[PDB]
Symmetry: D6
Subunit: 51 residues, 12 copies
């Protein structure tokens, strides 16, 4: 499944993590990414609309 | 620059090509990709809004 | 076998997926690909023309 | 550009070679490939259908 | 063993497949390859003389 | 040297880009990264803290 | 998981090793790294600041 | 062109070298390879019939 | 362990194969290699000089 | 030659850099490495005895 | 664990092998390596002081 | 051509280096290697037996 418990965007936050398709994202990173597009630049798949 | 003159999505069309960021896209492919998101799944950068 | 359930062409669609040889394809993408050739540009093998039973 | 002058399908024929997109193909191999699809299994791009001037 | 059931030369035929050393070959491809040499250009090992 | 002018973190922003060590970063991304550490997770070198003359 | 028990920074120390995220670090190396940043240059993830129970 | 002047089969002989397609072959190696097939196992292309 | 039973030097012979360290060698190839050195050019380890019981 | 001007051990210091064999080292890192052995763990070659 | 039973330095000796950290070393090679530094050039870790 | 002037076997010696085929070797290492075989374990080609004019 998903690797180690860290936001694959900022490689630092381990709490308040949302499950992206094959990796994790912290809330702050997820927000900024949703701000810019519906598609994740890390895994090329759609971003979580949850939380 | 960009490689050989072919739509990097369908690898077939060579005419009516729009310049994506580091590759090409035919009009049909570009449309279907814009239909789904503003971000290109091939190069992870924004899709051309031109044409 | 086949990876996460997303169209490997558009990396977005997750429902209405047809099984290509080692990946998936949504109907819209599959249609456009068949429009151009019987051979898939992603896996080099023949595109699914039929959904079976 | 294109590599040594040999059919990239059979790696043997060196005369009567047609230019595929980034490699060569002998007539026999090209014929057999066109028999199966318009798309080349070696370079994923369209097979040469015409030899030009 | 051998991978997916397809002629590794033409990547299309799935019926009437002969077992080459670590891959498959359709009858038409096998014939053309035997026409040219006893050694397979795909796996570098000897071609099947069967069928 | 540095590649195409896009923020290597969000791969979208192309204006208001700051030069990180071997890539670019938009202000929003850079701000969020500085919030977390002085070291860039993309290139492992220190984040730009100052824009120079 | 984590590899052979040696500090991945100095590849020499094998006792007094702290667990970084996917490797080890001796106290001396860890100290010097914390001196420079909270983020590890070897694995790009945060340096261990605390040894736990 | 061809790399360093050594038989790519035995990696030892540097004299009496025949030019194979993208490498070299000493006379002894070339003979043994021709003994077995017309196709070179190193470069997958036809063996030199010269010498 | 060792792969398909073919001489890794000539990729053709499948009978009368001697076990080199991580691959096979036919007698003819092995003979020619011993003629040149005690060390195998394919696996960098010593050539089999003896077949054992 | 050597790459970007940063200590290849700590990837942070850019001043007071000593030239190791194919990379750089800051004074603090060089000291700690010399403390432990004469051979550099980054490039496998001998450490600078200068400074 | 360690791979095949051969000195990873000279790739020839299989007897009188000392266990280095993730490979083997024959006595002669180990001596010459210790002669030059305490750190192994093959695996970057400390050399065996045993034997 | 050949890289930095260090014995590729012991990665330490930089003087008294003999030119092997695509790298260097110090006399001590070369001697030990010749002791074992005429073929170099590093580059798979023959060891230098003679230094020329
Ligand atoms: Zn984050
Ligand atoms: Zn994602
Ligand atoms: Zn297209
Ligand atoms: Zn694109
Ligand atoms: Zn799709
Ligand atoms: Zn497919
Ligand atoms: Zn051909
Ligand atoms: Zn082609
Ligand atoms: Zn076929
Ligand atoms: Zn075959
Ligand atoms: Zn950004
Ligand atoms: Zn950076
Ligand atoms: Zn350490
Ligand atoms: Zn770490
Ligand atoms: Zn030879
Ligand atoms: Zn050849
Ligand atoms: Zn053989
Ligand atoms: Zn061998
Ligand atoms: Zn440093
Ligand atoms: Zn160094
Ligand atoms: Zn040894
Ligand atoms: Zn070692
Ligand atoms: Zn040496
Ligand atoms: Zn050598």
């Amino acid at each position: 499944h998903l690797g180690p418990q860290f936001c694959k965007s900022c490689w630092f936050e381990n709490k308040g993590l949302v499950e992206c398709n094959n990796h994790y994202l912290c809330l702050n990173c997820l927000t900024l990414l949703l701000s810019v597009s519906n598609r994740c630049p890390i895994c090329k798949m759609p971003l979580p609309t949850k939380l």
